[PDB]
Amino acid sequence: PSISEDMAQSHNRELQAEILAPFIAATLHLASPDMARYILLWTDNLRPGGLDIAGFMTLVLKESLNANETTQLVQFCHVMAQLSLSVQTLRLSEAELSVLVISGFAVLGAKNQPAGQHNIDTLFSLYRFHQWINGLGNPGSDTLDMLRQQTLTADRLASVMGLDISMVTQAMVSAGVNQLQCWQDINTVLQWIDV
Amino acid sequence: GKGNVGASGNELKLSNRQIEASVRLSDLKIFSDYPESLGNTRQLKQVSVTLPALVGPYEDIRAVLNYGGSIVMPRGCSAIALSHGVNDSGQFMLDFNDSRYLPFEGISVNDSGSLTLSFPDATDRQKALLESLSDIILHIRYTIR
Amino acid sequence: QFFDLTQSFCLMAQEALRRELTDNGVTFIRGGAWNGTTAGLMAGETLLLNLAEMEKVWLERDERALEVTRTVSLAQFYQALSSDNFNLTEKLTQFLRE
Amino acid sequence: QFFDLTQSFCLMAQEALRRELTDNGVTFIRGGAWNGTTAGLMAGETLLL
């Protein structure tokens, strides 16, 4: 009843996700419409059952015109349920998720898989990044700022941590990283300095 | 069955079965009517029209006023009609307090656009009626700021 | 009861709009405002959105239609009929005689 | 949805005023009422201003 096909045949994915965000926020027991829109972007980037968001909404507006793919629609639904409860359990907050989704998880990195799959590695890496976000403290948010671009530099990093610069120099020479392009690099420096 | 006299904007023609008479609004020289003192922006807001020809009972004159300017204000006021012409303004009432806009409101006082008096089927049913036609009066009320 | 009554009024409003615009396709009352799972609450503001949509449609598609008046004479009309052209007054007086 | 609709109404009102004063430069609505960070709240009183 609420929405129709008029903006369903459009090409503006972000507009469609933004306008659908309240409905998913309700059906998914989710906090804010912005997180609904972000997780919509994420599920689109997954493409669970060979679907996009516009297709998702067109099929929903269809009155169960798919005999078998309605189960695929509800599989998409359970998939966003899983990602949403991942967010709830890991307690990720607004800005970190926004950066990760707007960067297509490029600021994370993964193994033999772009962005992020739905396996254990993604969950573990996101959890690590989140404890590190929390332990950054007050300036850590603007740290994410310099993380959104590739201006994340060594001396600023060490100064935020409160640690020595030369430690970080040795860590980048040992870990082989010349620039902290992705959180894989950051995490490797983290593990080397932790050792 | 066809005539043409006049220049662009100020013309009279008989197209198809329809007599057209276009008047260039800028051609009327409303600027010179009153001094530039105590007035900066002038614009048209009302037009009534009179057709005092030989008309008895039961004869129904049909006229159309159309404006074809560049300033395009939404429909409802871009054209008016004439049936009686006895100080006919094109409405059941002459109210200046209308919540809505009067037809032909906001026009530039000497816009490059033109206004057309059009008589349908004068070939034809209004041929006799417009044969007896003498002339037309245009009472234009306009405001000056 | 109050919701049923305002629902009937809003339906009547939609029909009035439909007649005014002489288009019988535009619909805004799509039902479901009495959401049963939630005691049928919070339908007033959904109806308010319906009314806002009504007002938007009415104003945006508004068109001050051009007005024309036509005078018709029954004597001339009947005297000038394509299939049965006849004197109207004479037939009147005759039908009066019988 | 309601805020989008009232945004439309406010913009057509602005256009009506621009016609009335016959000046096309005066602007009052400059967007930003739908503050996305705040779930698009706080637009109503903005339109009031």
Distances (CA, A) of A134 to A9, A116, A130, A150: 41, 21, 6, 21
Neighbours of B39 (CB within 10 A): 12
**Distance from first CA to last CA of chain D, Å, rounded?**
21
- Cα three-residue angle C36-A29-C33, rounded to 5 degrees: 25
Q: Which chains form contacts with chain D, at 3 or more CB pairs under 8 Å?
A: A, B, C
Burial (CB count within 10 angstroms: exposed 0-12, middle 13-18, buried 19+), residue A157: buried
User: Which is nearest to D19 in space by CA: B25, B144, B73, B41?
Assistant: B73
**Distance from first CA to last CA of chain A, Å, rounded?**
58
- Cα–Cα distance between A172 and A109 in angstroms, integer? 17
Dihedral class, residue A109 (left if φ above 0, else alpha if ψ from -120 to 50, else beta):
left
- Cα–Cα distance between B128 and B53 in angstroms, integer? 11
> How is residue B88 written in tokens?
């006919």
**Documented resolution in Å:** 3.9
- Cα–Cα distance between A36 and A24 in angstroms, integer? 6
Please indicate the experimental technique that yielded this structure. Answer: cryo-EM
Q: Do C49 and D2 touch (CB under 8 A)?
A: yes
User: Number of residue pairs across A and C with CB atoms under 8 Å?
Assistant: 3
- Cα–Cα distance between C46 and C7 in angstroms, integer? 11
**Interface residue of C61, C67, C79, C88 to substitute, partner B, most B CBs within 10 Å:** C67
Q: Which residues contact A19 (CB under 8 A, 6 or more apart)?
A: A3, A7
The strands making up B63-67's β-sheet, listed across from edge to edge, are B4-7, B10-15, B18-24, B114-120, B63-67, B79-82
Chains A and B: 3 or more CB pairs within 8 Å of each other: no
B105 contacts B45 by C-beta, under 8 angstroms: yes
Q: Which residue among C63, C68, C69 sits closest to B76, beta carbon to beta carbon?
A: C63
B44 contacts B138 by C-beta, under 8 angstroms: no
Please give the DSSP secondary-structure letter assigned to residue A151. -
Burial (CB count within 10 angstroms: exposed 0-12, middle 13-18, buried 19+), residue C1: exposed
- Cα–Cα distance between B142 and C15 in angstroms, integer? 40
B106 contacts B45 by C-beta, under 8 angstroms: yes
Number of separate helices (H) and strands (E) present in chain A: 10, 0
- Cα–Cα distance between B87 and A99 in angstroms, integer? 71
Contact residues, chain D to chain A, C-beta under 8 Å = 36-37, 39-40
- Cα–Cα distance between D5 and D13 in angstroms, integer? 12
Q: Which chains form contacts with chain B, at 3 or more CB pairs under 8 Å?
A: C, D
